[PDB]
């Protein structure tokens, strides 16, 4: 899935819009909106640490 989302930057007063592919298994829909408005799996349980 080709997902796009907002993200923080080194400047606290600046933001950036980025995109990156994500496997469907690591994505969960919010269900409030269909066809978009996705969320990372296990995001409602803990913040994963990048290896």
């Amino acid at each position, epitope marked *: 899935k080709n997902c*796009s989302f907002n993200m923080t*930057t080194e400047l606290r*007063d*600046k*933001r950036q*819009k*980025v*995109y990156s592919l994500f496997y469907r298994l690591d994505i969960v829909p919010i269900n409030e909106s269909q066809g978009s408005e996705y969320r990372l799996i296990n995001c409602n349980t803990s913040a994963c640490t990048q290896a």
Partner: antibody, heavy 132, light 107 residues
Framework: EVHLVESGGGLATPGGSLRLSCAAS????????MNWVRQTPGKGLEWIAS????????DYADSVMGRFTISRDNSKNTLSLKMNSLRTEDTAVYYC?????????????????????????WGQGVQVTVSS | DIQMTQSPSSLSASVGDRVTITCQAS??????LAWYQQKPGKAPKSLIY???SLESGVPSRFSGSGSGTDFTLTISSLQPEDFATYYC?????????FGQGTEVEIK
């Protein structure tokens, strides 16, 4: 390839209301800013409005500020421009333009700000005029 | 507010003839200036986006120059497919004012 089409323009009573629509295909419509410009006879081109990718931030020229209203719907890949209290000076060929670069990158408030754009792709304008 | 002036208003040329178009800005705009050409009855087309960067697909013959307040366009070998209005537009400003529009025709 990027294809643009606009419809809804035409004759309208002076001081009334009108609605202009524009559809696009061949690209991610949810990642490009949209602008509306006019071409009056004799006098050169003139930009009248702009809208961000998400359709939240809007900006218009002082000549149409408050009278017009730009909007878009990313789900249907359509763009619109509502007209209210239009006058005889608004008769022109309205073109549905798209910016040259997508809104990705750093930004301050809205995703596409902090970047300079230009009208790279233009749709075949539609004539608009008012008379008795 | 910022305003633009374009000259010459109109001129005549021929196949292979060399002519140029120029425009000025009331205030400094660095290099955010684009050029467009519009055939009669068709929508305008982008030719040069930056002050000196040519648009993809357009013949390499085309070129531009300038910075700060003045800019110029050089058509070089005018061929029959270069006869249409040339508009000088400046961006990086709230109004994105266009030029007066200059039409080049056959002598």
């Amino acid at each position: 390839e990027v294809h643009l089409v606009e419809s809804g323009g035409g004759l309208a009573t002076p001081g009334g209301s009108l609605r202009l629509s524009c559809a696009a295909s061949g690209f991610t419509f949810s990642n490009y800013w949209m602008n509306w410009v006019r071409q009056t006879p004799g006098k050169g081109l003139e930009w009248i409005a702009s809208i961000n990718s998400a359709g939240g931030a809007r900006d218009y020229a002082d000549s149409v500020m408050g009278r017009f209203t730009i909007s878009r719907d990313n789900s249907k890949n359509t763009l619109s421009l509502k007209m209210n209290s239009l006058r005889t000076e608004d008769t022109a060929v309205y073109y549905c333009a798209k910016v040259d670069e997508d809104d990705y990158g750093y930004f301050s408030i809205v995703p596409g700000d902090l970047k300079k754009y230009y009208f790279k792709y233009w749709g075949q304008g539609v004539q608009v005029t008012v008379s008795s | 507010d910022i305003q633009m002036t374009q000259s010459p208003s109109s001129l005549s040329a021929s196949v292979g003839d060399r002519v140029t178009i120029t425009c000025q800005a009331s205030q400094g705009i660095s290099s955010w200036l684009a050029w467009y050409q519009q055939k009669p009855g068709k929508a305008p087309k982008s030719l040069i986006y930056k002050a000196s960067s040519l648009e993809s697909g357009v013949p390499s013959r085309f070129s531009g120059s300038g910075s700060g307040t003045d800019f110029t366009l050089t058509i070089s070998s005018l061929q029959p497919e270069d006869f249409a209005t040339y508009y000088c537009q400046q961006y990086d400003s709230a109004p994105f004012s266009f030029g007066q529009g200059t039409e080049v025709e056959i002598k």
